[PDB]
Design a protein around this ligand. Structure first.
Ligand SMILES: *[C@@H]1O[C@H](CO[C@@H]2O[C@@H](C)[C@@H](O)[C@@H](O)[C@@H]2O)[C@@H](O[C@@H]2O[C@H](CO)[C@@H](O[C@@H]3O[C@H](CO)[C@@H](O)[C@H](O)[C@@H]3O)[C@H](O)[C@H]2NC(C)=O)[C@H](O)[C@H]1NC(C)=O
Ligand SMILES: *[C@@H]1O[C@H](CO)[C@@H](O[C@@H]2O[C@H](CO)[C@@H](O)[C@H](O)[C@H]2NC(C)=O)[C@H](O)[C@H]1NC(C)=O
Ligand SMILES: CC(=O)N[C@@H](CO)C(=O)N[C@@H](CC(=O)O)C(=O)O
Ligand SMILES: *[C@@H]1O[C@H](CO)[C@@H](O)[C@H](O)[C@H]1NC(C)=O
Ligand SMILES: [Cl-]
Ligand SMILES: [Zn+2]
Length: 607
């Protein structure tokens, strides 16, 4: 480690700690910068040489983290918890958690190489037919979204899961052991316990379970209604009205979001078409229009525009030179208070427009907290960070707002039109809930050792069936590693944040709508141009992780806890409607034929 980046000496007290944090701050930015830059260079241009550079950068970060971590632990270990400055406690607490920096050098290099190889496998995996091969984004994504051929969807689903999952498995095992070894030296029973500690809630798991209990009936009814719509198209052979839905038929590789099957499920097709994808295509929208439209929502609230550095640096389309990139949309803070970027292989669709807002919400958080200490540049919790862009996207999605931006010619205000809208939103928001909940249940079980490698797939499918009521459309065994075919698993990005975000965003929505002085139905609120709503949201953003999330939430929404009531309020009309419809159709709620799998198509997989 560079002499300039090394910690000096400070007194064994709070006044020393302060100078410690400020000295940390000065060097941490450069170290964070070089790490993020190397990661950027790799993720926008996947090469062996860029991987080597990124690992080298990661080693430097671990060296830095070890030095300042051991210094923090040398001077402040039995005393930091009693510090009077709560922000300083949070800075110190972060600095003294070494993570992977606890590993000896050889194991550090192993760990860094595993992360690099897992990332490369996921993002360069292909499905091949001919010499021609399909990438996940955009090829397989488009098939899952718009093909209605059972056999073709199966080819894409199986192809992807086989291609990404199978080679990831041995690496993922090794990563798990090393991660646990690292965090066990920070005092956590396993990595999952460390991840859960970010919510600073001794009752976190029970609180999530209580939330899910309230949400589950909404999902069960949506599921039964959707299954019926699928049965009408795919027939009795491929859809079991009392069994799980085959996992490839829901519009999405992970069946995580069901908005792409909206045309099959739309209750009243004679009302205005609420999926504006075809209109965006008709009008010739490109990625840059999408990002500018997103930005203009943020400025309408008197939040920050995207700086020149964002526009100059970002990767907003998949590169045309055909170079390998990480296509999964992400938002980047370079920690120099200047560079902030999105990397998205943007496609011209309504869901992608929502995704643009999601990523821009991350950027806005970065812009607002850029002048806090580096350790405090994160959300009040990770679910807050995930919720910002989605909150705005809720307003953007409204038929009224779409009309304002020229994406919906007709405007209607009737019960049918409300049901269509709320159903479309349920496909996006309700359908996701089980998946957002289950991923880290799976991962926590793996970190804790409850799920050994011998049960990775058995336990993944247990949870997928239990929560989502889906089944794999082909037979799977333990050679398959279907959890690894989801981005966040090989890229080691925690998932419970998305479940938290999906509850939280409705709490935020309700509060900002109230602040905007909006008086109507919650699901028709558009906060666009509300400078009052903007100021309320800005208070959250500028706080970063400087204050307990429970207190930041209290200030914003009047409650110090996650609460399903705003989501329930928002969906109330369609919750009642689906329940009525299912009863009148004589549906079974759930999937009591839990063992059921669909047969293979006759000529699978030739032609
Ligand atoms: C779409 O339509 C709904 C429903 O509108 C109501 O019912 C219709 C069948 C007609 O009879 C309408 O004349 C009638 O307003 C609209 O929701 C409604 O918005 C109004 C005005 O913002 C709300 O009234 C307010 O109520 C609060 C107290 O809650 C008072 O403080 C205010 O002074 C104000 O009078 C009303 O609560 C609300 N109705 C329901 C059932 O939620 C909606 O605004 C409209 N949307 C669009 C996009 O046009
Ligand atoms: C993708 O990454 C490679 C490195 O792996 C880049 O190629 C290098 O570019 C530097 C600086 O422009 C040159 O000095 C080197 O000669 C190149 N090195 C190697 C090993 O080829 C490449 O430019 C990157 N591509 C894009 C489009 O950014
Ligand atoms: C696509 C994207 O980057 N956004 C994600 C986070 O990775 C997100 O908001 N949530 C879920 C579901 C989704 O609709 O994107 C995800 O795993 O992608
Ligand atoms: C799992 O399934 C594949 C193909 O369906 C098969 O080739 C393989 O033998 C099975 N793996 C094991 C370990 O039995
Ligand atoms: Cl998280
Ligand atoms: Zn995100």
């Amino acid at each position: 480690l560079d002499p300039g980046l090394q910690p000096g000496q400070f007194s064994a007290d709070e006044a020393g700690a302060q100078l410690f944090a400020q000295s940390y701050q000065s060097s941490a930015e450069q170290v964070l910068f070089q790490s993020v830059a190397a990661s950027w260079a790799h993720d926008t241009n996947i090469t062996a040489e860029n991987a080597r550079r990124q690992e080298e950068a990661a080693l430097l970060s671990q060296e830095f983290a070890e030095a300042w971590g051991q210094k923090a632990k040398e001077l402040y270990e039995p005393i930091w918890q009693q510090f009077t400055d709560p922000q300083l406690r949070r800075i110190i607490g972060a600095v003294r958690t070494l993570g992977s920096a606890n590993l000896p050098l050889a194991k550090r290099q192993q760990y860094n190489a595993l992360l690099s190889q897992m990332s490369r496998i996921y993002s360069t995996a292909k499905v091949c037919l001919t010499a021609t091969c399909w990438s996940l984004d955009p090829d397989l994504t488009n098939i899952l979204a718009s093909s209605r051929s059972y056999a073709m969807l199966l080819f894409a689903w199986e192809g992807w899961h086989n291609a990404a999952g199978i080679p990831l498995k041995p690496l993922y095992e090794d990563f798990t052991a090393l991660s646990n070894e690292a965090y066990k030296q920070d005092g956590f029973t396993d990595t999952g316990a460390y991840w859960r500690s970010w919510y600073n809630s001794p009752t976190f798991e029970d609180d999530l379970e209580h939330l899910y209990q309230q949400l589950e009936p909404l999902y069960l009814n949506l599921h039964a209604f959707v299954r019926r719509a699928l049965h009408r198209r795919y027939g009795d052979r491929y859809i079991n009205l009392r069994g799980p839905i085959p996992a490839h038929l829901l519009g999405d590789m992970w069946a995580q979001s069901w908005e792409n099957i909206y045309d099959m499920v739309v209750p009243f097709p004679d009302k205005p078409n609420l999926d504006v994808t075809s209109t965006m295509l008709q009008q010739g929208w490109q990625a840059t229009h999408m990002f500018r439209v997103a930005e203009e929502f943020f400025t309408s609230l008197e939040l920050s525009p995207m700086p020149p550095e964002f526009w100059e640096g970002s990767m907003l389309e998949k590169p045309a030179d055909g170079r390998e990139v990480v296509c999964h949309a992400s938002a980047w803070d370079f920690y120099n208070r200047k560079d902030f970027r999105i990397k998205q292989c943007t496609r011209v669709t309504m869901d992608q427009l929502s995704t643009v807002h999601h990523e821009m919400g991350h950027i806005q958080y970065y812009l607002q907290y850029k002048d806090l200490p580096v350790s405090l540049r994160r959300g009040a919790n990770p679910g807050f960070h995930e919720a910002i862009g989605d909150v705005l996207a809720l307003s953007v999605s409204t038929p009224e707002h779409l009309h304002k931006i020229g994406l919906l010619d007709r405007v209607t205000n009737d019960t049918e039109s409300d049901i269509n809208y709320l159903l479309k939103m349920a496909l996006e928001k309700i359908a996701f809930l089980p998946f957002g909940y289950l991923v880290d249940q799976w991962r926590w079980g793996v970190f804790s050792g409850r799920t050994p490698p011998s049960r990775y797939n058995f336990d993944w499918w247990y949870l997928r069936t239990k929560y989502q009521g889906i089944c794999p459309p082909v037979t799977r065994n333990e050679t398959h590693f279907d959890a690894g075919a989801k981005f966040h698993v090989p890229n080691v990005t925690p998932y419970i944040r998305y479940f938290v975000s999906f509850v939280l965003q409705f709490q935020f929505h309700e509060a900002l709508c109230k602040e905007a002085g909006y008086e109507g139905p919650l699901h028709q609120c558009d906060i666009y141009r509300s400078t009052k709503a903007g100021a309320k949201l800005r208070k959250v953003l500028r706080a970063g992780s400087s204050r307990p999330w429970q207190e930041v939430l209290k200030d914003m929404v009047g409650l110090d806890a996650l609460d399903a009531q705003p989501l329930l309020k928002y969906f109330q009309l369609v919750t009642q409607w689906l329940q009525e419809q299912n009863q009148q159709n004589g549906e079974v709620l759930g999937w009591p034929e839990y063992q059921w799998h669909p047969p293979l198509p006759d000529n699978y997989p030739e032609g």
